[PDB]
Amino acid sequence: MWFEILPGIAVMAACLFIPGMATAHIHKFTNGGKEKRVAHFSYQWNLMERDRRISGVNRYHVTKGLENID
Amino acid sequence: MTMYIAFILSTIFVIGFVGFSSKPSPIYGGLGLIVSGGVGCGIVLNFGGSFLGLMVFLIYLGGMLVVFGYTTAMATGDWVIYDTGDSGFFSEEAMGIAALYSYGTWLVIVTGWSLLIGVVVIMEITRGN
Amino acid sequence: MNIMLTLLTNVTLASLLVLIAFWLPQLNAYSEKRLPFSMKFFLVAITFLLFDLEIALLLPLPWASQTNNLKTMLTMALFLLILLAASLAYEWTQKGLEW
Amino acid sequence: SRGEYVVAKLDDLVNWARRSSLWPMTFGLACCAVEMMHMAAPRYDMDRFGVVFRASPRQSDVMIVAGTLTNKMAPALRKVYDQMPEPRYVVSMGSCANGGGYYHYSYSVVRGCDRIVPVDIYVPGCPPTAEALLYGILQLQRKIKREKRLRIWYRR
Amino acid sequence: TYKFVNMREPSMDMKSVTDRAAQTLLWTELVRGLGMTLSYLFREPATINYPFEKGPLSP
Amino acid sequence: GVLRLVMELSGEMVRKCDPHIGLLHRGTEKLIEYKTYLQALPYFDRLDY
Amino acid sequence: MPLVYMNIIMAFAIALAGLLMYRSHLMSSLLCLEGMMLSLFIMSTLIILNTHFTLANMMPIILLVFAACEAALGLSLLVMVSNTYGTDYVQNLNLLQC
Amino acid sequence: AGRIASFLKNAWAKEPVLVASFAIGGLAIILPSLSPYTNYAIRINRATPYNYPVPLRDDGNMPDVPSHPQDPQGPSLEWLKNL
Amino acid sequence: MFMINILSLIIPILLAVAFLTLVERKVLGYMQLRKGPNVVGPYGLLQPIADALKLFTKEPLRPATSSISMFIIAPILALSLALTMWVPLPMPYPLINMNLGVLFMLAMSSLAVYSILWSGWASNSKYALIGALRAVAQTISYEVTLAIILLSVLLMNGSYTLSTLITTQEHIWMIFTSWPLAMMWFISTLAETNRAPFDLTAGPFAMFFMAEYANIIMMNAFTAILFLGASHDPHTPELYTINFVLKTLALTITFLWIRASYPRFRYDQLMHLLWKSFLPLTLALCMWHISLPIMTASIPPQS
Ligand SMILES: CCCCCCCCCCCCCCCCC[C@@H](O)O[C@H](CO[C@H](O)CCCCCCCCCCCCCCC)COP(=O)(O)OCC[N+](C)(C)C
Ligand SMILES: CCCCCCCCCCCCCCCCC[C@@H](O)O[C@H](CO[C@H](O)CCCCCCCCCCCCCCC)COP(=O)(O)OCC[N+](C)(C)C
Ligand SMILES: CCCCCCCC/C=C\CCCCCCCC(=O)O[C@H](COC(=O)CCCCCCC/C=C/CCCCCCCC)COP(=O)(O)OCCN
Ligand SMILES: CCCCCCCC/C=C\CCCCCCCC(=O)O[C@H](COC(=O)CCCCCCC/C=C/CCCCCCCC)COP(=O)(O)OCCN
Ligand code: SF4
Question: What's the number of CA atoms in the CB half-sphere (13 Å) around residue I107?
Answer without folding.
Answer: 23
